Amino acid sequence: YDIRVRAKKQRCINSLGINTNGLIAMGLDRNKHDSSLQIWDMNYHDDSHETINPMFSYCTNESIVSLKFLNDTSVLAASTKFLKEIDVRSPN
Amino acid sequence: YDIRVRAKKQRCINSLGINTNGLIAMGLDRNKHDSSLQIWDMNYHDDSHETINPMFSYCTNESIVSLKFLNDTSVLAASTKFLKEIDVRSPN
């Protein structure tokens, strides 16, 4: 098909990763009131809205400039000052 | 395998539904501080804890006594006084 989606706050998408199990992550620029690593599934997305509803949100007030999906659960994200590895089964 | 899971507050599981896309719902008794329709995926469950982390929570202060998965997104839940149909793509 063809679907346009965006964050709650509209800002540049630096990085993008689509996993094997359909899970989609997003790397955005720096916004103090929104997460820069929003991970969600397209199967649970309401088609009536452009904004996404993220299952997992990380990296508030940061600028995720690169990300990669290592496996079905963990994501290796890179900010402008840090190099992170985030697992969706943990909040840390 | 074999995994035992439970709600944050331990109470009787009246109803249970496992969907085709791996999504699992749960019908519990009445607790005023916890949801009685907790929907989650087993792929994003931390194996180090017994308590579940629900992606979608509904029906607080109710006793879900029967539930059924109509399709990949909507669930037809039944409380002790109401008959509901809840879609996970909407908060209503």
Swiss-Prot record, chains A, B:
Localization, UniProt: Cytoplasm; Vacuole membrane
Source organism superkingdom: Eukaryota
Mapped WD repeat ranges: 8-50
Functional note: Component of the SEA complex which coats the vacuolar membrane and is involved in intracellular trafficking, autophagy, response to nitrogen starvation, and amino acid biogenesis.
Additional remark text: Present with 184 molecules/cell in log phase SD medium.
Family: Belongs to the WD repeat mio family.
Assembly and binders: Component of the SEA complex composed of at least IML1/SEA1, RTC1/SEA2, MTC5/SEA3, NPR2, NPR3, SEA4, SEC13 and SEH1.
The protein's name: SEH-associated protein 4
Species the sequence originates in: Saccharomyces cerevisiae (strain ATCC 204508 / S288c)
Shown residues within the full chain: 140 to 231 of 1038
